[PDB]
Amino acid sequence: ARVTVQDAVEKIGNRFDLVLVAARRARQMQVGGKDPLVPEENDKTTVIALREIEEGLINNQILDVRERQEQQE
Amino acid sequence: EIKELLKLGDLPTSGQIRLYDGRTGEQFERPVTVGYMYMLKLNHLVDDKM
């Protein structure tokens, strides 16, 4: 259940870092592991990734810190 | 001549008969042009296309 991606662009104004950040996170949530931090509505990880964008808790920085820490572990 | 042929029939002269929806079941305003058109089917059928 998602119609517009306007607020996602309001949180990341570049609109192309939107695509890369959402795609990187949704790939890391698709095939295995690293569970979504939002309740889902029986919808695919595309809408889940954009929804977690519009909750603000996903950008390039969170992926940087988490991938770096998974490298450190 | 069309007005005369209509006057032979029971239909009004302007040909605009009042009609009624099936959903609302009430009268449309501004009575409408109905009639009998000769129509044709063309050979662009959908299961040929799809």
Partner: protein, 51 residues
């Protein structure tokens, strides 16, 4: 065979997957857009009128 279970699977796999719609003489960039499908009986694409 198109059995009883496959249609529910199809309604699973559509629900949030866009498609591209495209009139063939593509003049400008509104010649191609994206839409979320909703399954309709019949054999012809229903399309939102304003677009």
């Amino acid at each position: 065979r198109e059995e009883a279970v496959v249609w529910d699977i199809l309604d699973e796999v559509i629900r949030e997957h866009p498609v591209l719609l495209n009139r063939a003489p593509t003049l400008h960039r509104l010649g191609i857009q994206a839409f979320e499908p909703v399954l309709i009986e019949g054999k012809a694409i229903q399309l939102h009128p304003l677009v």
